[PDB]
Design a protein around this motif. Sequence first.
Motif, PDB file in Angstrom:
ATOM      1  N   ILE A   9       0.841  -1.186   0.000  1.00 41.04           N
ATOM      2  CA  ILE A   9       0.000   0.000   0.000  1.00 41.04           C
ATOM      3  C   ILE A   9       0.884   1.247   0.000  1.00 41.04           C
ATOM      4  O   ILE A   9       0.649   2.181  -0.766  1.00 41.04           O
ATOM      5  N   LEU A  12       2.239   2.054  -3.486  1.00 33.32           N
ATOM      6  CA  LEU A  12       1.368   2.824  -4.358  1.00 33.32           C
ATOM      7  C   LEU A  12       1.141   4.211  -3.751  1.00 33.32           C
ATOM      8  O   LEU A  12       0.813   5.157  -4.463  1.00 33.32           O
ATOM      9  N   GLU A  13       1.325   4.285  -2.441  1.00 32.74           N
ATOM     10  CA  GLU A  13       1.144   5.539  -1.730  1.00 32.74           C
ATOM     11  C   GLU A  13       2.289   6.502  -2.052  1.00 32.74           C
ATOM     12  O   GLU A  13       2.074   7.705  -2.184  1.00 32.74           O
ATOM     13  N   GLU A  15       4.094   6.232  -4.767  1.00 34.02           N
ATOM     14  CA  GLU A  15       4.001   6.478  -6.196  1.00 34.02           C
ATOM     15  C   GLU A  15       3.098   7.683  -6.469  1.00 34.02           C
ATOM     16  O   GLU A  15       3.402   8.509  -7.328  1.00 34.02           O
ATOM     17  N   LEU A  19       2.836  11.947  -8.490  1.00 36.52           N
ATOM     18  CA  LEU A  19       1.799  12.686  -9.190  1.00 36.52           C
ATOM     19  C   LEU A  19       2.030  14.187  -9.000  1.00 36.52           C
ATOM     20  O   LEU A  19       1.839  14.971  -9.928  1.00 36.52           O
TER      21      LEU A  19
ATOM     22  N   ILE B   9      -4.797  -2.119  -3.026  1.00 37.99           N
ATOM     23  CA  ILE B   9      -3.633  -1.823  -3.842  1.00 37.99           C
ATOM     24  C   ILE B   9      -4.058  -1.718  -5.309  1.00 37.99           C
ATOM     25  O   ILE B   9      -3.463  -0.967  -6.079  1.00 37.99           O
ATOM     26  N   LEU B  12      -5.251   1.832  -5.637  1.00 36.01           N
ATOM     27  CA  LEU B  12      -4.157   2.789  -5.650  1.00 36.01           C
ATOM     28  C   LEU B  12      -3.341   2.606  -6.932  1.00 36.01           C
ATOM     29  O   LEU B  12      -2.755   3.561  -7.440  1.00 36.01           O
ATOM     30  N   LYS B  13      -3.331   1.375  -7.419  1.00 35.49           N
ATOM     31  CA  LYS B  13      -2.598   1.055  -8.632  1.00 35.49           C
ATOM     32  C   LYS B  13      -3.266   1.744  -9.822  1.00 35.49           C
ATOM     33  O   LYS B  13      -2.588   2.180 -10.753  1.00 35.49           O
ATOM     34  N   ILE B  16      -2.838   5.842  -9.234  1.00 39.11           N
ATOM     35  CA  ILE B  16      -1.537   6.322  -9.672  1.00 39.11           C
ATOM     36  C   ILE B  16      -1.425   6.166 -11.190  1.00 39.11           C
ATOM     37  O   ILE B  16      -0.819   7.000 -11.859  1.00 39.11           O
ATOM     38  N   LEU B  19      -3.152   9.288 -12.676  1.00 42.81           N
ATOM     39  CA  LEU B  19      -2.319  10.476 -12.600  1.00 42.81           C
ATOM     40  C   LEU B  19      -1.096  10.295 -13.499  1.00 42.81           C
ATOM     41  O   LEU B  19      -0.592  11.260 -14.073  1.00 42.81           O
ATOM     42  N   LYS B  20      -0.652   9.051 -13.598  1.00 50.57           N
ATOM     43  CA  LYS B  20       0.504   8.730 -14.420  1.00 50.57           C
ATOM     44  C   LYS B  20       0.294   9.292 -15.827  1.00 50.57           C
ATOM     45  O   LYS B  20       1.165   9.978 -16.362  1.00 50.57           O
TER      46      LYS B  20
END
Lengths: 21, 21
Positions: A9, A12-13, A15, A19, B9, B12-13, B16, B19-20
């Motif tokens: 977690i 990804l947090e 990551e 942003l 996850i 969040l995956k 991100i 935003l990626k």
Amino acid sequence: EIAALEKEIAALEKEIAALEK
Amino acid sequence: KIAALKEKIAALKEKIAALKE
């Protein structure tokens, strides 16, 4: 293994931090 | 549940991943 799932977690947090940066 | 976290996850995956791009 749930400790690895929760640990991911933060992965990804961190990551998401990209942003902004 | 392993899927429980695997899901978080997974969120969040995707977050991100959004935003990626």
